[PDB]
Structures are given as structure tokens and as C-alpha cells.
Swiss-Prot record, chain A:
The lineage of its organism: Eukaryota, Metazoa, Chordata, Craniata, Vertebrata. It is found in: Mitochondrion inner membrane; Nucleus. Complex I is composed of 45 different subunits. Interacts with CARD15, but not with CARD4. Interacts with STAT3, but not with STAT1, STAT2 and STAT5A. Interacts with OLFM4. The chain crosses the membrane at residues 27-46. Belongs to the complex I NDUFA13 subunit family. Accessory subunit of the mitochondrial membrane respiratory chain NADH dehydrogenase (Complex I), that is believed not to be involved in catalysis. Complex I functions in the transfer of electrons from NADH to the respiratory chain. The immediate electron acceptor for the enzyme is believed to be ubiquinone. Involved in the interferon/all-trans-retinoic acid (IFN/RA) induced cell death. This apoptotic activity is inhibited by interaction with viral IRF1. Prevents the transactivation of STAT3 target genes. The chain holds residues 32 to 74 of 144 of the full protein. This is NADH dehydrogenase [ubiquinone] 1 alpha subcomplex subunit 13.
Swiss-Prot record, chain B:
Belongs to the complex I 49 kDa subunit family. Core subunit of the mitochondrial membrane respiratory chain NADH dehydrogenase (Complex I) which catalyzes electron transfer from NADH through the respiratory chain, using ubiquinone as an electron acceptor. Essential for the catalytic activity and assembly of complex I. Redox-sensitive, critical component of the oxygen-sensing pathway in the pulmonary vasculature which plays a key role in acute pulmonary oxygen-sensing and hypoxic pulmonary vasoconstriction. Plays an important role in carotid body sensing of hypoxia. The gene is NDUFS2. This is NADH dehydrogenase [ubiquinone] iron-sulfur protein 2, mitochondrial. It is found in: Mitochondrion inner membrane. Coiled coil: none annotated. It comes from the Eukaryota. The chain holds residues 196 to 249 of 463 of the full protein. Core subunit of respiratory chain NADH dehydrogenase (Complex I) which is composed of 45 different subunits. Component of the iron-sulfur (IP) fragment of the enzyme. Interacts with NDUFAF3. Interacts with NDUFAF7. Interacts with CERS2.
Length: 69, 54
């Protein structure tokens, strides 16, 4: 009996298949989150600066109140 | 670019396992000759080519 190297292909490994595809981001939907984070960013920040004004006037009031200084 | 060199050389080092099992040295082989092919493929290699290509 002769024994040589046997042939096997099975699945053929798929000859040239695309793996690159669009994922997560679509296009217009990313701008809704992108610019949406900006509008949420300013509104949250400016409310803190209005709360800073409560401290600001109260800080300068200490100088006016102190005349024996 | 640093990554694409090392990403492929892991796979490329597996390629010289085919060469070592088919001929003496790692890189250069006196394998292809005017009389066709010097030595036949061993029984282990033909299953490994399919396993690599997958």
C-alpha cells in the first residue's frame, strides 16, 4: 500500500471576504450626540457660574463690612 | 508604523514551521530542483495548511 499526502479543503477558508463594515456610527446620528453634548455642556457650566455669583458678591461684601481693618 | 510589523511577524514565524517540516533550514531551501521536487510533503503538513488558511 502507498501512503502519500492527502488532500483536504473542507470549507475552502472563503476566498476573499470583506471584513470592513460600518459600525456604531452612522453619520447624522453622531452629530445629534456630538452637538447635543455641547448644548448640555454650556447649560450645566453656566448654572455653576450663576452659583459662583452668590459667593462672589458675598466675598466682596466682607471688605465693605470690615472698616476697622 | 510599529504595530503592523509585529502583527504579521507572529503569523510569518508560523510560516517557517512549514519550511522546517518540508526542508532542512529555516529560510533558504534546496527544495525546487531541475528534477522537479526534492522531497515529498510529510503527513503532518497537509492538515496544517488547511488549519493555517482557515
Amino acid at each position: 500500500x502507498x501512503x502519500x499526502x492527502x488532500x483536504x479543503x473542507x470549507x475552502x477558508x472563503x476566498x476573499x471576504x470583506x471584513x470592513x463594515x460600518x459600525x456604531x456610527x452612522x453619520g447624522y446620528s453622531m452629530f445629534a450626540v456630538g452637538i447635543g453634548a455641547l448644548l448640555f455642556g454650556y447649560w450645566s457650566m453656566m448654572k455653576w457660574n450663576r452659583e459662583r455669583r452668590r459667593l462672589q458678591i458675598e466675598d466682596f461684601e466682607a471688605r465693605i463690612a470690615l472698616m476697622p481693618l | 508604523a510599529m504595530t503592523p510589523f509585529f502583527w504579521m511577524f507572529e503569523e510569518r514565524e508560523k510560516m517557517f514551521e512549514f519550511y522546517e517540516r518540508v526542508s532542512g533550514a529555516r529560510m533558504h531551501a534546496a527544495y525546487v530542483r531541475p528534477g522537479g521536487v526534492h522531497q515529498d510533503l510529510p503527513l503532518g503538513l497537509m492538515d496544517d495548511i488547511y488549519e493555517f488558511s482557515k
